[PDB]
Structure formats: structure tokens, C-alpha cells
Symmetry: C3
Subunit: 176 residues, 3 copies
């Protein structure tokens, strides 16, 4: 048993709208691969807010069904998520559940467990400005969702109009 | 060749006894998977100390035999370390050596090599306080032990009565 | 598919020459393994400068051909890069492209994309000094190089006459 790889594609186009935004104004480069029990995530985000949002934090939620497909309520455009085949996405995902966060380790809708979060930080293009990122495993999700993956970015002060981050990695326990 | 996965299970109960403590009062969520020559670890820790520990540091040591079994003298109760089968533990570990720290990269009982340590840090439930973890590969071990992982946690001042960390990750070169 | 593992070996001898030095005065411990779409790197560096360097930063470039062998112009001596067979190093590298950074995600010769970089940090043996490490995916190349992987270490003041880092990890998306 070798597991599939779920991703947004290597070099995707604008594929994420942010809270209170009309059209998609950011690119999310997410990719999940697995060995043994462990899923490994790689992440990089860049966007530009069309409005100066009065708030030091800004977030972005992924919600998945039982097979690992992204649900429409997510901040990611459905089109931009699938299985890795070479340098492309394969659209109808199969056996995605294996790359999702383990439901016993990271119980659904329980926000009070530190053990279900990953705190990390990413560097920003301009200056040595750092963004804190907080990833939430199964913590933030809608009734319809089976799994989840929340990304919350806090800025040193007020978010810039435009930003790109570096490549940030993370690991967590896979389901099954 | 596909390697096995060793872990404390996905949602273990109290399973570590901290130095100077009578009963297990801490939960260690550890998991080691592998591809190629690299072993990937995920760590998350929660504890509470029945007495107020006069000391900034707080450690816990794992000692393994040749097959990758946790030895009695470890801070982990040995009932709580096994192979992954779905969400369960399998108690006779077979071929665990592949997840142990490479004996040539990280020689036994040589504490003077920086290359044998991983310095990382975790976030603590309360505020955002950090705690510095220092994993030591084969550095701290008993005579009878074959391999070792030692975790030391330095708190910014004095350890709290109770605490839970986020999910931390680390990689190292595997044996064989 | 099961991908190979490329590395400098587990406990290599002096195998890297720093920009300006005539002989190798450094030890690079690097290993790349892969699972699914993700390549996972481990890194620790030890070196000493035979002169006092007027330069706060310090850097070493790896340049690879189509199969993932290191070219001569790389700061790493060629002798010290190969495939993993247990604790040894196998020299005709076959099928190494899979461990190299994906060319669609991390375009060649392009340095203005933050997404092509991995900012991280290592701890230095003496005190709790950190050194900032910036890995560049295909950003620094020679006309002959197919792929590239550049490490730049910025020190808090001038770089010391000798140093050793702890073990540091990163992930990126692999080619094919």
C-alpha cells in the first residue's frame, strides 16, 4: 500500500478567496503526501487583499468530505484540488481519506485541544517580516464536513496590501 | 521494502512518568514513520506535576533494545509503545530497528557532537508561551540500551503545574 | 514506485569548500528522501574558515545535472554524493531526478519568487546562537546545471572561525 498525493498543483493560478472578498485574490500551494502513519504537508501562500481589512489576523478554511474532496464552502476553489499525476491534478479523488487528519488523534469540532494544532511561522518577501501561522486539524469545520484544515495567519501588525510567503512544512497523523 | 510505523497510538492516556514522580502524570504522543533513509517524527506532550518542580528544565528519556522496543527504564510506560495497525498498537515489535537513529550518523554516548541533536520549539496552551525542546539522538542512554531518544524541555522560567504543547515535527537518518 | 535516497553518506569527512577557500574546510550532511510528491531533507553543517572572512553571510551552492549528480562547480566535492545503500554511498546515481526540486513549482534562474525559498534556522554549538539558513530551489544555477539547491547562512554578527549546526529539516515538491 502506497498512498496517493493530494495537492493544488505545482504552480497554480489564483485559487483562494479570503473572508469578505468577492473573487479569488490569492494562490495557495498545498500538498499532502504520506508514509507509514505520517502525512507531510508543504505550504506557501501569496495574496493581495483588494481591501485594507481592519484586522491583524486573516484566515482560510478547508473542509473535506469522506473521500478527501474539498467542499464548496471552503476558501479554496474546488477546481484547484486533486490527485498528483506527474505535474497535473486528477479531479475525481479516490482514497483521499488517507491524507486527512486522524479522527481519533484530532477529534472533530474540539477546539480546546492544543494537541490538535500546529504552530509554525513563514517569512515574507519584504524585510525579514515574519507571519505566524496556526494550523487546525479537524478543529474548525461545518456540519457537512468530514475532515478539516484551518489556516490562520497573524501579522506583526496590520496585514500588507500584498504578500507572498516562503515554503513551510508540517507533519500530522493520517486517518486509517 | 516498506517500513513499519512505531507510535504511542493516536490518542493514548497518561503514559509517561516524569523524573522524581510516583505515577505517570504525562501524555506523550510520539510517532515515527519512514521513507528512504529519513525517519519522520511527530511529537506532542501534555503533563502535570504533582509537586512544584524546583528546576527550569524537565526531561524524559526513551531507551530502546535492538528491535526497537522501549526498555523498562524509559520514562514511557512500555505498555504504550508498539507498531501501527490502523488505530491500534501491536505489542511484539518486529523490525523496529529501521526507525531508530542511525548508529554511524549519531554515535552512541557521544554528547559532544551537535550534529546528534535537534533543537526545536513548541507552543504551550496558555498565552503563546514557547518551550524549547532538544531531542538527542543516541546521546543519553543506559548501558543495556541499543538506541535512544532523549527529550529535554526548557521552560522560559519555571515549569507550570500543568501544560499541553502543540504538534511538533522532526526528521533524522534511520538505521539500516 | 519507490524512490531512491541521495545523500552525502551518514558520517562523511571534510567534503565542502567555501567560496574563497582553496581546500575543503567543511562537512555537509545532507540526505534527500521522498514519499509521494514530497522530498524531505535533513541538513547539518560543520565548518571552519582558514582566514577571517569580511562577509556576514556565508554560502554554498549545489548544482545538479539531469540525473541528480553534482557538477564540479558545486561547493560539494563530487566524491561525496551518491545513492543510499545502507550506510554506504553508491556513485553512478540512477533516477535521481525524482529528488530534485520540481521545475514547474520552482522555476530555474528565478529569484524574485518567495515561493521558491525555504527560510529556516539552525542552532550553533556555542551558546544559544542561531544562524539563519535560506535554501533556494533552482534559484542559483550554472548554464550546465539542470537543477540547483543553494544554501546561504546569515550569522548574527561576523561568521565564527569554527562552528557546528544541529540537525535541521525541510520539505519541497520533487520533480516528476
Amino acid at each position: 500500500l502506497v498512498y496517493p498525493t493530494l495537492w493544488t498543483g505545482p504552480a497554480p493560478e489564483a485559487n483562494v478567496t479570503f473572508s469578505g472578498e468577492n473573487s479569488p485574490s490569492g494562490i495557495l500551494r498545498l500538498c499532502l503526501s504520506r508514509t507509514g502513519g505520517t502525512v507531510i504537508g508543504t505550504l506557501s501562500v501569496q495574496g493581495s487583499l483588494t481591501n485594507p481589512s481592519t484586522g491583524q489576523t486573516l484566515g482560510m478554511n478547508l473542509y473535506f468530505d469522506a473521500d478527501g474532496n474539498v467542499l464548496s464552502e471552503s476558501n479554496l476553489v474546488r477546481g484547484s484540488w486533486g490527485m498528483k499525476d506527474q505535474d497535473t491534478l486528477v479531479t475525481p479523488i479516490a482514497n483521499g481519506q488517507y491524507l486527512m487528519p486522524n479522527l481519533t488523534a484530532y477529534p472533530r469540532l474540539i477546539q480546546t485541544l492544543t494537541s490538535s494544532y500546529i504552530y509554525t511561522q513563514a517569512h515574507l518577501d519584504h524585510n525579514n517580516s515574519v507571519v505566524d501561522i496556526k494550523i487546525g486539524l479537524n478543529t474548525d469545520l461545518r456540519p457537512t464536513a468530514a475532515y478539516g484544515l484551518s489556516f490562520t495567519m497573524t501579522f506583526t501588525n496590520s496585514p500588507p496590501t500584498s504578500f507572498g510567503t516562503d515554503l513551510v512544512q508540517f507533519g500530522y497523523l493520517g486517518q486509517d
